[model samples]
Target: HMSLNTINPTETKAWAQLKEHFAETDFDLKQLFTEDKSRFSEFSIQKENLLFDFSKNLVDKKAFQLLLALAEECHLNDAIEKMFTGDLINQTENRAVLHTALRNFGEEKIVVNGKSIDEDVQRVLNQMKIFSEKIISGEHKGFSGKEITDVVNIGIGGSDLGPVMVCSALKHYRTRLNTHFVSNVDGNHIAEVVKNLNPETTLFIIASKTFTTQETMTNALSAKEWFLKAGKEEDVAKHFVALSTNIEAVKNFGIAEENIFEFWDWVGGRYSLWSAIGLSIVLAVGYDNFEKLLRGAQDTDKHFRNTEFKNNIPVLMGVLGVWYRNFFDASSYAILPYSQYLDRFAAYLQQGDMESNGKSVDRNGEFVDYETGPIIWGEPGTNGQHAFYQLIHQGTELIPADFIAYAKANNNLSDHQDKLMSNFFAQTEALAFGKTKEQVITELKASGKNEEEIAFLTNFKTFTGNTPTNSFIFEELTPFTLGQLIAFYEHKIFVQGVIWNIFSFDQWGVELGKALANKILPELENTAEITSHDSSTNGLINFYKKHK
Candidate 1:
């Protein structure tokens, strides 16, 4: 796990060539396809039922060559090896980023400091399987001797996001148990979730590595208080569990040592879904299904580790991102999954991508001259078609959108998926080769719109097409497929981080806001207020103090 401080990419020959090339030519997706009949085949990667087609995106093959050259100059391949080998790649934190080891499939021997944690990993995995299976089989009884029915996961950020997203994605394959995530520090969130829960038949999973995250612990303690409203002190062990490394804290919280599943520091919060943080997922879906999820990620990991940038899906995804973000002056990216069940995918990546690459400094502590992470935000498709699609269709910004859709629906409703996919296929095409002025004029004229209306609506109706979109078509939303999909983005994030020459593993930005909130929290309780704060903050606090 070696750390690298990359020379500014602009200093590279490839970056200069790419910039000069960008100035000389327009990016015409329609023209690219017209010139080359095999453009789609050339730009797409089909591996394990997932077709990652970037034919709709990127400027040209020359641009790709330049981007690939940039990656080479940045020593991306060497950095990738360091990440997988457990080098303390997270230089700022002095830890190795090894979330990849969480989904260890036994093909590779993962090691750190002349020691392999495979046996420890396997032991925890066995615990996860046995415990998850016990709950699923109705063998794990609650304090009231009733079988557990609801699993309330008390976590925030990655702990909540990954499990919630995975469980929602694989909703069709769920066991009898229901999984609910309590994240936000807002008391209303926990109150609303607990409204439907039976204390006697519910298992509360407190997930925080340090067991001291304000939001997670606040919710965890609130849950315990709520549970004791109907049960006794001895019942805490039966109803509560911990997915944390802090065993003493777990015991202090009244959770049994056996019930406290251990997670590692190498496993980041955003990526900890594969560790005990995913116990809720294992409880929702069976342990076998969870293993299938691991296998799916392992498959994609193997591809990312083995394949070349020319054919690698995750690499291509990263390279395309660099093309849009660096060269095209694009500020934002959208992830529009066509499936209703995939509503949370974009939200999930917001933390994963932004937190990883939102750095402004290189590994050498030099300030970056260019953008590292894009402003990532998106909702599910069709809904977005009604909301932001208007802006996307005719807006001034050159926003790159990723359209992900499953070929086979989990519901497999009659003729419904076809209509859904029709729009799915139509959207990319419309984004690529939008209506010409001539086509719009002819259509409007045929609709009996006179010259006045036609003239007035021409600009509004015209699409100005060539909005870039990549079509991620998966077979279905199985646990395995979902795992593959997530791991694909995770690796893509790594790829981009490698090329950007920034440390992606450490998230210093998240801590500043947290520390400030902690600072203000005690100030809120002070009657001796208005001592040390900026004008706006001081005013707000005084106002709150006055009102309350």
Candidate 2:
């Protein structure tokens, strides 16, 4: 029989020890670090070209031991086994959460429902290679015999965000194909995307699992109408493709059977990037680099599945997050990647973490007494340093931060990379042990300040500096590194979900707003009458109509 209790014995014991430690100490991270010379090295983890420097967090060796115990008590090992081996861990959805399989590079077969899913995953990969090569080599032409130069991906949420993020992340590797994404239901979104592209030289990949997402279909229809105005309706089959399971819907939409890409139902939309939803990624970086991304994730997956809790990267991240959310009362965490290329990294994580773990109920259908997820938000540094560092440095509430940076910049822009790295390193250092009053006084005196001025400035400049943060220092952002980064966080979310005993995969929380929007949409079309919705909804709808 499957056990509902997933916490390990060590974890339970560690929690007890942790409670004792809290009672004995004041929970000051700086003091813990100051007392232990090797604190950072002891708390950190490194694997497969990724260095996770978690030493700056609000934990010591004892705290770390307890967290690892928690992982064991939770049966994190069993959960990892279930995730990789194709068990239907997403119980409510009755589907296997096998986004990891999309990136599997091993010889072992991952079976679901007595059928090997590895074969299907490879088949789509091969198809992607052939189709992407054709487009890149100028062999795939539109109806007017123009070689496709631009690719517009019509999708929303998982469909749009994942591919768009990957494409932007690897824009440095893009050759002949330029990519654009249209996801909004607003007509302006579609119009703006299509304005500059030549209808004859552009290919559209409509990505909707059901082939019926309102935003995707609305944009797809508008794009087709625009294309038809310039070319024949028959040309859609030549210029348009689909990443959907609904063949009948794809056929009705005029996408050729040859151009229809299929993915399994087991893959959730948010986790579908490695599936056909990555058509844009395959186009942007070519199939070889795309495979490298998958290979990288597979490497991390192997580590996550095999590594002991004490040495595991994802487990440490999960436990650290739990420590903050449950113990420290940190409502949000910042993800500041030093690379400008990773501007959307935080946004991607926001969806991955928030959509997966933002639940109010535990796994056993009981109300959870604790918080499940943190508000994951950030922008690339030093932009964020200039904008929000003040708040982080002096804000009333404690904010735990994750700083990700590359040792070498992808762009060889002289001292620019060095300056960027300096700030990235300095920010974490500043947050960990902020400036003391004495140090502030000395600096003020050095600037030729009077004693009174020095005293006044010291108060303002002194920082309480016990903030928690982790730094992920990598060689650079490659396809493999990007995959590793994403996979690490994916596993982190999984661990937190298991620890919180929540259904991480299902997002019933997002349904109510969507349902309400459906009711308001029709009323929005008519400017003549005001429908009797709640005051706020009615006013918003009426306002939109008035503007139209």
Please report the candidate that would top lDDT against the real structure. 1
TM-score of 1: 0.98
CA lDDT for candidate 1: 0.88
Q: Please, what is the whole-model Cα lDDT of each candidate in the order they appear?
A: 0.88, 0.84
Query: How many angstroms is residue 306 displaced in model 2 relative to the true structure, after the best TM-score fit?
Result: 0.5
Residue-wise C-alpha lDDT for candidate 2, range 62-139, written one tens digit per residue: 777877777777777888888778887877777778888888854678888899988888888899889999999999
Please provide, for model 1 over 377-461, each residue's C-alpha lDDT reduced to its tens digit, 9 standing for 90 to 100. 8988778899898888888888999999899988987898999999999988999999989989999999999999999988788
Off by over 4 Å in 1: none
TM-score per candidate, chains pooled: 0.98, 0.96
Give candidates' CA RMSD values in order: 1.3, 2.0
Model 2 Cα displacement at 162 (Å)? 1.2
